[PDB]
Design a protein around this ligand. Sequence first.
Ligand SMILES: Nc1ncnc2c1ncn2[C@@H]1O[C@H](COP(=O)(O)OP(=O)(O)O)[C@@H](O)[C@H]1O
Ligand SMILES: Cc1c(C(=O)NS(=O)(=O)C2CC2)cc(-c2ccc(Cl)cc2)c2cc[nH]c12
Ligand SMILES: O=C(O)[C@@H]1CCCC[C@H]1C(=O)O
Ligand SMILES: [Mg+2]
Ligand SMILES: [Mg+2]
Length: 258
Amino acid sequence: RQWALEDFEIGRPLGKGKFGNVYLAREKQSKFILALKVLFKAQLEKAGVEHQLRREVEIQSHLRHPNILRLYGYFHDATRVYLILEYAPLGTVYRELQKLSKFDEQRTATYITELANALSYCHSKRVIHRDIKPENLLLGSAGELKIADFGWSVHAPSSRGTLDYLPPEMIEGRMHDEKVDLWSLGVLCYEFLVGKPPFEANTYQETYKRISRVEFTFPDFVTEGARDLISRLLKHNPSQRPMLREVLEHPWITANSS
Ligand SMILES: Nc1ncnc2c1ncn2[C@@H]1O[C@H](COP(=O)(O)OP(=O)(O)O)[C@@H](O)[C@H]1O
Ligand SMILES: Cc1c(C(=O)NS(=O)(=O)C2CC2)cc(-c2ccc(Cl)cc2)c2cc[nH]c12
Ligand SMILES: O=C(O)[C@@H]1CCCC[C@H]1C(=O)O
Ligand SMILES: [Mg+2]
Ligand SMILES: [Mg+2]
């Protein structure tokens, strides 16, 4: 409400969103570089997602953690909603994975620790992110992971692209809690080591079946300790999924995390 578009110089697009685009921007008085996530009112209204968005703002604005992207504020005009975000200068984990094909165990373990810590803080406030995926994981100036895109975040317990990161309970439209993010963590650990998520398929229908069945195999290069942690996280039964305390203390994480 205090901020308006006239307060910012707009730079290049940083990435595209479902309901608009994110741009690099600079606040005129302070010269503060930040990111402006621009969303079109007509598209949000058509999707009936105005309430979710109010919630993305409300949830993210109260989070304060070095591995969680900051949301400084918002404003809106006749056609758009603007979220004022911390700029993540090293881009997405998505792009790094495309470039490198797969990460080594040390880079994987480090990212998994940073994510587990950010998720521990979230779950302490009963906040479920629910959209943990590489395009929503950004990199700070020191290459540290930052959980971003709280677009689908909710307070636990609750109801609501590809299904690749979604657990069975969310896929079936059943009730879910914080355990959904533990499943996504297992999908991500596999994807970082293998280069593709474990339930990846040509069609949505084939992916749905693979998730429902928890039907996946590891390539031979995946180590025993990596197989153990992934297998523990990818449990059909949410209750069976470990606590984040356990993920951080896991022998493969403690041995490879930097
Ligand atoms: N703060 C940021 N700094 C740098 N790039 C960003 C930032 N926020 C978003 N992006 C880029 O824009 C993309 C879309 O942003 P995101 O918040 O995930 O939107 P959506 O909810 O539409 O998926 C990201 O995947 C990333 O490439
Ligand atoms: C129509 C309208 C308004 C709205 O109240 N607009 S107004 O000021 O009454 C009118 C002169 C423009 C507000 C929002 C909105 C703003 C901030 C957040 Cl975080 C979430 C939602 C949305 C989203 C889609 N449509 C919206
Ligand atoms: O921030 C957004 O673009 C949206 C807000 C409304 C719910 C869906 C959400 C998304 O992240 O896709
Ligand atoms: Mg996103
Ligand atoms: Mg989103």
